[PDB]
Amino acid sequence: FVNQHLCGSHLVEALYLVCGERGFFYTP
Amino acid sequence: FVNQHLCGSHLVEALYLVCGERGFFYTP
Amino acid sequence: FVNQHLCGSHLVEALYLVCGERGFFYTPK
Amino acid sequence: FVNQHLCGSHLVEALYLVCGERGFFYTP
Amino acid sequence: FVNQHLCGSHLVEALYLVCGERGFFYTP
Amino acid sequence: FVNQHLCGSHLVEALYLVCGERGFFYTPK
Amino acid sequence: GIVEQCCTSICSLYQLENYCN
Amino acid sequence: GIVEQCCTSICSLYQLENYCN
Amino acid sequence: GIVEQCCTSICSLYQLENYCN
Amino acid sequence: GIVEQCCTSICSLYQLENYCN
Amino acid sequence: GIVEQCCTSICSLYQLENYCN
Amino acid sequence: GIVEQCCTSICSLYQLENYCN
Ligand SMILES: Oc1cccc(O)c1
Ligand SMILES: Oc1cccc(O)c1
Ligand SMILES: Oc1cccc(O)c1
Ligand SMILES: Oc1cccc(O)c1
Ligand SMILES: Oc1cccc(O)c1
Ligand SMILES: Oc1cccc(O)c1
Ligand SMILES: Oc1cccc(O)c1
Ligand SMILES: Oc1cccc(O)c1
Ligand SMILES: [Cl-]
Ligand SMILES: [Cl-]
Ligand SMILES: [Cl-]
Ligand SMILES: [Cl-]
Ligand SMILES: [Cl-]
Ligand SMILES: [Zn+2]
Ligand SMILES: [Zn+2]
């Protein structure tokens, strides 16, 4: 199962939304 | 405005995919 | 162009994340 | 779990698409 | 262009949901 | 859990992005 | 609710439509 | 094609089903 | 409604929260 | 990191804010 | 097929490209 | 930046790869 890959997909979307103009690093 | 917001949502999606275990830096 | 439809798709996702256990109502129209 | 959180994300998109003009309540 | 690119992302998810076990063929 | 369903949703978004102008054929099972 | 019905097993679009307003 | 049909104006789930296998 | 308020100018999370149950 | 922290148990949007820039 | 190949273990982008037209 | 480069014309995944860590 590709659980961690699917989770990350959603994490990045959530970060995009919450962080806004601040941006973010995604460092898995 | 909203068009840029929606574009960035998809940019983050594509970065997640192409960057893999490297991750990425998103800055608007 | 389907701009409002694409906007709606993203609004629904944002409401899902913001609202948590409260949930939300996406009104008709 | 995260499982259910991620499933919920997909459920809301499916309802968005199925319900179209009617809208919907999401009450988890 | 970008608009069509963003639209297509959503089109593919809608076809995924509509088509179920049938799958689908996508051409731009 | 609906594992394969949620996986498939992401598979098709990945195919969309990787395939670009070629498009793709999603034929599960 | 919808999570228990549709996260345990795949709900069809017809099944999901029951949740529309 | 599908882009010209469904990106200009909203396609119903019925119209989309046309592209299913 | 939400489309009118949030589909030209971006709604913040605070603004979106106004649409939670 | 974020995956250890948030793929195990759900992180709220407020929790995820710690990973912002 | 693709679900068997790519939902069990992560598929690379090259592996996914097999399913391009 | 990325928005400048990629929201006004399509960026391939190879172009996007410039923004990987
Ligand atoms: O990212 C954002 C969020 C809210 C308003 C805005 O102009 C930008
Ligand atoms: O960001 C992405 C893009 C494509 C598939 C996926 O699971 C995540
Ligand atoms: O049973 C489900 C769960 C998530 C999305 C969907 O379309 C159906
Ligand atoms: O016409 C469209 C375009 C994109 C998604 C969708 O559900 C319908
Ligand atoms: O104004 C908007 C439109 C779509 C998503 C979002 O987070 C904000
Ligand atoms: O803990 C998580 C994991 C993925 C998405 C999200 O919003 C929260
Ligand atoms: O193996 C997979 C499954 C889902 C998305 C992806 O990019 C790869
Ligand atoms: O140029 C772009 C804009 C948004 C997503 C993407 O994959 C490419
Ligand atoms: Cl994985
Ligand atoms: Cl529209
Ligand atoms: Cl969009
Ligand atoms: Cl499943
Ligand atoms: Cl998922
Ligand atoms: Zn979009
Ligand atoms: Zn998912």
Numbering used by the authors:
A (entry chain J), B (entry chain B), D (entry chain L), E (entry chain D): 1 to 28
C (entry chain F), F (entry chain H): 1 to 29
G (entry chain K), H (entry chain C), I (entry chain E), J (entry chain I), K (entry chain G), L (entry chain A): 1 to 21
Task: Please give me the paper's original passages concerning this structure.
The therapeutic hormone insulin is a small protein used daily in the medical treatment of diabetes by millions of people. The insulin molecule consists of two chains, A and B, with 21 and 30 residues respectively. In the presence of divalent ions like zinc, the monomers assemble into hexamers, where each of the two central zinc ions is coordinated by three histidine residues.
The crystals obtained in presence of urea will be referred to as C2221urea and C2urea while the two crystal forms obtained with thiocyanate are referred to as C2221scn and C2scn. They contain one hexamer with R6 conformation in the asymmetric unit and have a solvent content of 50%. In the C2urea structure, two additional resorcinol molecules could be fitted into the electron density. In close proximity to the PheB1 residue of the three B chains with non-helical conformation in the C2urea structure there was an electron density peak with a height of 5 σ in the 2Fo-Fc map and ~5 σ in a Fo-Fc difference map. Seven urea molecules were built into the C2 structure. The nitrogen atoms hydrogen bond primarily to the carbonyl oxygen of GlnA5, but the carbonyl oxygen of SerA9 and IleA10 are also within a reasonable hydrogen bonding distance (average 3.1 Å).
